[PDB]
Amino acid sequence: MATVMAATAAERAVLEEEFRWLLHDEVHAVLKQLQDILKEASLRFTLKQENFILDQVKGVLTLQGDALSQADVNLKMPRLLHFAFREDKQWKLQQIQDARNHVSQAIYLLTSRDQSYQFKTGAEVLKLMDAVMLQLTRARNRLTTPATLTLPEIAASGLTRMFPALPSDLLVNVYINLNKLCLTVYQLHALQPGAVLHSPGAMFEWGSQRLEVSHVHKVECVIPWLNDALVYFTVSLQLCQQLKDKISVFSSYWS
Amino acid sequence: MATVMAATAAERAVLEEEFRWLLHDEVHAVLKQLQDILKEASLRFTLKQENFILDQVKGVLTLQGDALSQADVNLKMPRLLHFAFREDKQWKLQQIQDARNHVSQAIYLLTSRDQSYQFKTGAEVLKLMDAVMLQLTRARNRLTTPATLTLPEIAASGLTRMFPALPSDLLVNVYINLNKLCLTVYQLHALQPGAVLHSPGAMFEWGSQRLEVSHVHKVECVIPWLNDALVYFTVSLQLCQQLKDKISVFSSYWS
Amino acid sequence: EVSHVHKVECVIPWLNDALVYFTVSLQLCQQLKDKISVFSSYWS
Amino acid sequence: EVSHVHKVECVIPWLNDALVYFTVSLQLCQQLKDKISVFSSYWSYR
């Protein structure tokens, strides 16, 4: 009988539609929450603590946003030496700038969409989620220790120029590792008549001379607002994943 | 006007071409660097330290390349027993052999290509990168503790045969865990009238008898050249990923 | 506003056993997938 | 100046055989390479 089948088909069509509205509201709820969390994460990168104390080598670094405004270092040798920047100079930590960029892009992805359209399949939501998650994971990854930084790249870095001015038996590197501001001093040794190891006994060329890393000193300190930011990234990623999974369940449920 | 459009189109075509050459040089630079790093990683697996001292159970193991040439073990019981190999015998650690194979394959992938061809889309570079990265990640994974090794497989291993010759209340396993040579002694207990747990209170059958693990003793020691190799793997993976990402950015930029 | 946070924890043995089981099962699955791929690429 | 061009040709059976042998050999080599790569990507050759 055709009347049965038609009224009936109307009943399933009604249920599916109502569920589509439920999923619509869920999607926009999660999106709004993402904008809130991510804007707070953004606010963490611009101005909260600025002075940090970092074993057997010690340091007091003043870090304002992405700019290492000052770096005062004491190295205890077999003998102590003391170093500082040009007083006037600032060294920018590229990791923070990069991360802040990814955050900015994610937030743009969330705020540049009309929060007023009727619900669809979800593949579009899925693409939005993928984009945002890519930005977050990239931010986090950049915050992490870059492995591909060579000793000659460290030497060619402006940071070496930034200090009283110091010899070529010492290299200084300052970077970020997830939730920790990191200061590393490489003690070198010219060799008698690659570069990736970063461990004692690593060899590389610099200038026109051949050098070997003799010792490595590593100190670090937690940066509270970086930690907050990372926590935000993790939470946002999970929110995105949950939305993706629910959308998949829905779409497979009614197909 | 058609003259405008043609000269113009020539201008964009010129810019895109020049950028294609930039990307060409970048690709080959990164590839060369990969061969250097990976060949050093390769050199680490063949001959550097050979004798290693490994809690409440102690061991002196002589490891040459992939071959555990000797293993001298002291076990302190409630009472001490002392064990060694047949003096003449060597136990090979399969993880190192496997890892070395993956490294060999990666290096082949890099050296068996003409470093002189004109630049293309990149999908081919992308496939090369995927292949290499798969080999690296597999090497690293193999170096890691294999979870799927059962106690009966440990018993059926030649290592048990390799020791003075010892009872069936003791099983000895030597394996690699990332950057650590590992020695584990399983103290057993025949049961009165699966096998995966590796924890105290795990049960399994061996020979024609049913046995239970009574206690587990685990000691380990860092292998410096393994650590160097792993560091190399990580750095290479990141270099590959960076190249993939840049190629994607380029390809999406001009499409 | 949260003023202080106190966190304590304790290992649950059977949860640990379960997790170990999950890891081992995942590896078994992965190994089977990889072998199947090797086979299929080998004869194609 | 070239006024006209005349081109005649003939199949050389043994040359043809040679080309066939080259191609077939190339194919054998690639198949072996593929098997070796497939196996070696997961297991050790020895």
UniProtKB/Swiss-Prot annotation, chain C:
It comes from the Eukaryota. Monomer. It is found in: Nucleus envelope; Presynapse; Cell projection, Axon; Perikaryon. This is Protein rogdi homolog. Widely expressed with highest levels in spinal cord, brain, heart and bone marrow. Also expressed in fetal brain and liver. It is linked to Kohlschuetter-Toenz syndrome: An autosomal recessive disorder characterized by severe global developmental delay, early-onset intractable seizures, spasticity, and amelogenesis imperfecta affecting both primary and secondary teeth and causing yellow or brown discoloration of the teeth. Although the phenotype is consistent, there is variability. Intellectual disability is related to the severity of seizures, and the disorder can thus be considered an epileptic encephalopathy. Some infants show normal development until seizure onset, whereas others are delayed from birth. Belongs to the rogdi family. The lineage of its organism: Eukaryota, Metazoa, Chordata, Craniata, Vertebrata. Transmembrane segments: none annotated.
